Amino acid sequence: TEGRSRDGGLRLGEMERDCLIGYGASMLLLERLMISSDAFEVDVCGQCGLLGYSGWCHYCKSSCHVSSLRIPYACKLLFQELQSMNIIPRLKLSKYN
Amino acid sequence: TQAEIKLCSLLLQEHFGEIVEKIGVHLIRTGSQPLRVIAHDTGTSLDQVKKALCVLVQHNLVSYQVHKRGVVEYEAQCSRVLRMLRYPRYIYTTKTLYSDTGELIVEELLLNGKLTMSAVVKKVADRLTETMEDGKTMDYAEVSNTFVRLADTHFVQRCPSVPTTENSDPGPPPPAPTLVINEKDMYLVPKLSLIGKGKRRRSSPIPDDGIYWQANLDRFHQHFRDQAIVSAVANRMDQTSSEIVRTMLRMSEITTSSSAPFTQPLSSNEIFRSLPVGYNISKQVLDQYLTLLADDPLEFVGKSGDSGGGMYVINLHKALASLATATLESVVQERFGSRCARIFRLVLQKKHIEQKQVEDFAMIPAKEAKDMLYKMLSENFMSLQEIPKTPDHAPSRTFYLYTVNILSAARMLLHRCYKSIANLIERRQFETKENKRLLEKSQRVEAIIASMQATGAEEAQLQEIEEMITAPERQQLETLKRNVNKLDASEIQVDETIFLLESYIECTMKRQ
Amino acid sequence: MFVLVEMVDTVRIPPWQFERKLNDSIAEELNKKLANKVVYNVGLCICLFDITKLEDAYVFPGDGASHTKVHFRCVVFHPFLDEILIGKIKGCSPEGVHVSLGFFDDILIPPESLQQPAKFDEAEQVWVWEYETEEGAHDLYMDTGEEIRFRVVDESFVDTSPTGPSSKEAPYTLVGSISEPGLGLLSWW
Amino acid sequence: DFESEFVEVLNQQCFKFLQSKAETARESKQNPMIQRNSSFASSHEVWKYICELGISKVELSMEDIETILNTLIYDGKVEMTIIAAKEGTVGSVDGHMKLYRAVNPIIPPTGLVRAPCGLCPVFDDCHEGGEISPSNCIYMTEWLEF
Amino acid sequence: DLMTYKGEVLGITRFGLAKMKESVLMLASFEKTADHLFDAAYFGQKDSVCGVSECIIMGIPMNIGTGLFKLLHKADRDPNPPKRPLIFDTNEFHIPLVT
Amino acid sequence: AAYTFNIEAVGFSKGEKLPDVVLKPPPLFPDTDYKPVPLKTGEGEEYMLALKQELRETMKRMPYFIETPEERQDIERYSKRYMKVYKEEWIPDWRRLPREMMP
Amino acid sequence: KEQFRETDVAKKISHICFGMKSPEEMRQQAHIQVVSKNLYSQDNQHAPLLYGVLDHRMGTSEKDRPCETCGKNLADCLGHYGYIDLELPCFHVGYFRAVIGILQMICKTCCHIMLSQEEKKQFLDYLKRPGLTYLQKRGLKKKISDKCRKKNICHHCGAFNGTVKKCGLLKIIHEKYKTNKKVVDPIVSNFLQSFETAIEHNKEVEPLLGRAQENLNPLVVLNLFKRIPAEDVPLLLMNPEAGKPSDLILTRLLVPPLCIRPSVVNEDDLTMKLTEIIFLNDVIKKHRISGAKTQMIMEDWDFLQLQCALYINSELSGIPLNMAPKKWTRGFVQRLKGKQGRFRGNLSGKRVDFSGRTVISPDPNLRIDEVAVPVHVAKILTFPEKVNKANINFLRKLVQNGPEVHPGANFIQQRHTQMKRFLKYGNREKMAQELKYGDIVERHLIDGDVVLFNRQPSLHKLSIMAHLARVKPHRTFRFNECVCTPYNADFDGDEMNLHLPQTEEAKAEALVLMGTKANLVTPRNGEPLIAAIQDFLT
RNA sequence: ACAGAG
DNA sequence: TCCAGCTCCACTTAA
DNA sequence: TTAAGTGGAGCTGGATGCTCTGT
């Protein structure tokens, strides 16, 4: 949340992101903006590229291609504010090797 | 053309298989492609591409033209694959006009694409041994007598032939031989003194080599164009009025092109000798029909002449527009009622009309006519004109004039028919596939009868066939067969709507 | 009666086992994951046979554990069609005869493939075989499981996957036959 | 509108008078040029017949039945030819006169309406694998039964 | 050198940046956020996550800095260990039956 | 309740007779006022129907019906010669076919 | 017995392929159909309706009422979609300049693309080269559409094709029947005289009949786009695997899950626009039966073209005066654009925890790489230290101190459990004896923790460096005054920020790369910044 | 929406 | 409040 | 004489710094 009245927490803004890039700090820029704000996982169907739930793609009606993915929650919110606009963000997931 | 590519995906699967339709649909969908990328973009082996291309270049379904750097590109004909649906109508119209030998001549050409004349007169005479009995074989004379009568009437045409390499470009072999049509010898048949007998399937060098014969699909469509016009006059005026229409179009078979708005004008002095003599009609009563058919505002025929007595022409493009209108207005009545078809005939005649004039001129009140207007703009039978007072184009200061456009509604109605047939094939293939347990069980009880039919077949094998548990299951197999026979027949009858629509869409295009 | 099945896999080795040779820790980890389980199209995996190629041991960001891609071969109980086996009976049912094969248990001798002079029981579970001269209709298939010799004619794979979101059918089935002359109990032939 | 309950019966009454008059010309078969002229009906002829039948108390005016016969044209059942008023019993237009004859439709009905696909109100929402599909349709499984 | 490596002097506006960078979310994270999204929907344009600004959005570590290289663990491992010899299905005893 | 737009620009000048609230969605298959026209019969229309079903069984048997090749057969056995699917193979006229299509 | 299944399918995102849905892949995604207009039931139960918006088969947005599709709470549900049917089609406001783009290239009669046969072979050979970039695509649509707009006749059907341009808000015109002062064309001379019956009753047709052209609308351009051949689709530069031209005109509309539009804003502006779209699908549906004029049906349709436009973008330019909104609502674009959107406000920069903020004050008795954290902030901030062989005796004592004495611990977490026992209660002498390896003790911030440190207007990279923390009893952040040059701190009521990194790798990237001893020189010109200042020079 | 602070 | 693209309109060359 | 390709002029749509601290 926002302020001192609401026990808010401080803001890595747009400019402070630009300083952490300049140091080349990759995992610190990962820890500040994913691990300690809004870490989350989603079920993704690797066949149709859409988001599923509970290991069940309701689009394809199957459970043989669902997979977990580490994503910030504000991007999962983006991936559902874009489908209502009919701008479908289809994913293709490879193995993490 | 998503309905066309869906429907062509089924006709290639039923008639050629699965590893050929992936090549066949991809050529329709994307365009002319060289050979190496079709194996890449689809993923089959390069040998199975060569099998799928040689079966599609056989049946005149894909073409090939040489391009820059000597590469060969394959281009499919989407209109040609849809004419694989009209095969049972082709084999029947050569049974009415020609003998049962000529019924089998067209059948071997439509099932092999390209054959030599020497091969087809053998295969038809072999298959006609089943149709006969008692020492009478089929001989190669009377088959070829039916064959050369087809080439006189252009139902069988010669394929484009190979070029003579001794005359044109001797030396290095091209990747593709670049075939070309020759106008003179399309119907100039090769002579065959060689005769023989059709073998009765007992189971116990070629002078026209390269001369391949194929079915001329453009000839049947000229013939089917006649019966759409002739049987239209037979319903409107008279059967004697229809035979005169039948007489003129039969005379106009060889003397006009297949795309001509006005045919060759024939004088009434020579129609009289051309008519069959069973009609007790004089020359003066013949001139009475030709001046009352000229009095029709539908303009099936016209005067278009003064010399040589009574000069008269019969119309071709305008006769299709009267049929495509009747094609388009027959569906408005059957989908939305007779009172809605009153409006669709009203707004067609008075070319631009509003709501208040329709309810007056058609005697259908408000709130019942306006429902029949609004369900047709959503079905795209009818459009608005929207003449504005201001360039603001605001809805509160303008006039919405209803308008029926024939061409945009005919292309729309054709696009519904392609999907309509694809749904019938999908319902039949669904009920065929889900009864694959019933049909094989009914096949195994018939295979005991089919295998060992005569040699060592005792009489104690006829009671173990109905004895299997398929005996109450025959209710469903009869419910199967009454479903397949209705969906196959409805698949044929929609093609009658396509030909009346597609001929009107083809004839209105200038193709400049 | 087995087949080797060549597979690839990515194995996580946690960092408290860095004292031990990696060839031993992979083999322990793949047996903890593939043993006594029916892989769908290939059958029932018994144990690891050998490791054939062992690629690089990466360390990914966000973890200290070493991930390595492993090429290996695994021994799999998967009898081919028309093979002759020997095993014991679990019991009898009107659905058929349940044949036990050591580790494996789902072998159904169907009543349509039993020896023909007896095909149905007298409302009893235990199946019979009527020979005319001796032992008419009482030659029984005992539930204690004397050794028989049967011939596999059908095998089937049912995909035991979840249908629907989250919050026991037999996956590897086998149909034998006994009707051939010489099959059956080891006493009879 | 005048009345939907009133003009609905004139559609099936005026057509039979244009049918029998076309039927007696068909039974005449004297001269097919004159048989065509034997099928045309005068606008004043058809108007004096319907008011003779005794349908309504209100008088059927000639200016209205001149317009009810246009609905027989718009239903595609009769034609209309305007001739000059060189001679006539009335000749209600100065120098003109109208003539009606009942005709047939051009074609038998199309093959699209014989399939259930041409009549479907949810045709645009049907696909291969979704909810509405040909493999589970009601409109075919009804039509396959009878 | 960044302004002039495509043969033309390009600004550091949103107009010069639309011609240099290829990532769609990098374009949509700066200016005209709506129009780049509908254009990528129209063209069907696929987008890698190779850029820096969309590694920060998608939560994967970026490529510059300490993400440029990969680390290997130096375990006591023997690649290609001695394989177990087969006994039955060797190739010298099983010449096929068909001609 | 009031909306963002003006209702008076949409309509409703009296202030009453607003449309009712749809409680349950419409059915998948709304019933029809009109029916399919029955099929055409006759000795010509039925022979084409008889000829059509004969073409399916014919063209599935001809060698132009290129089936997919089988694979992943498990073992070899002597009964392979008894299970060999024999069918004659058609060869085209290579003078008409391009050179790139030889097997 | 049990079939093998791969346990944890962790996968990495390779690429994102944008696209669009067909209007009947929306039905395959969604769970319910939304037909009702009212938000809540009228009774005192305050229950949501069963086939309207805020149905809980589409998700939940409060802790009290769970979801119905999956039976899970707010914390676990990924949200589920519904859909709305439209009685008449409407333009999608985002693709409206692309619907005009397709209409300028294809023929408006036969739906083929207006090119010669040789020109199709040229561009489709350009599209086969590998590595075609997004810049090379957008230049090609300029080159293709400029070749189509130079032709006035089709090379395939031969029908005339005029200009296609916008003629107001969400209206498309086609000048098919243009005239000149020259000899009149035969096809345009038929259109200007076929108005015969309309002039008979309406007098005002006669001044206006010259201005009559073909007015396109989503009933017609939907029907044209279904007849585009699939060979001619990539010349429109649409990838046909991500979208079709038929999908640009919407006829069905997904509604978002309820966690996109939370129940207490009471309702969101997206939910209130979805009420007005459902309401207009009953206003049009009633007027088609109750016999409204064509002037009313078109106006209602226009309202629906406006209400699906303001649902997506609520900042349009050419809204008429009688249809302009009274107040300002958020569409989807306004919650993506700007500084307070998703991309700048919630994605590129976001609020973090394990952070503090205090007034600063000087201290020269510290080193140049140390910072003095107050004890009130050192008890709140925690670093999760894993238990291993080297720190077990230390962490047992830090558990035994507890949450109130300073070298202490606020939480404790078991080995393979995700639940944190809050260590203020219970006997900590018992939970210190049960520390197994792999447990996480969330100790306080102690002497030697790498901590980031930031003054807020951050102009260069030395505005944020990392120090080593030391705990001191007062209430301010404190550092040596030689470090006042990079931060540009001045001790006049100055607030600086703090960040405790929560990972070992986040520590070591902060110590090696971002320390003060490794950032003495500025990266701009190599001059030293950490050096002496006033009263250290004097 | 306004005022502050650096 | 300032600034690139898009579209409309006269103005020569060329036949 | 006019078809056409290219200049100049007007319209349109986009953008305008970082945080906390309170009412």
Ligand code: SF4
């Ligand atoms: S719903 Fe069934 S019957 Fe109706 S059009 Fe679709 S496939 Fe044909």
Ligand SMILES: [Zn+2]
């Ligand atoms: Zn899926």
Ligand SMILES: [Zn+2]
């Ligand atoms: Zn849920």
Ligand SMILES: [Zn+2]
């Ligand atoms: Zn065109």
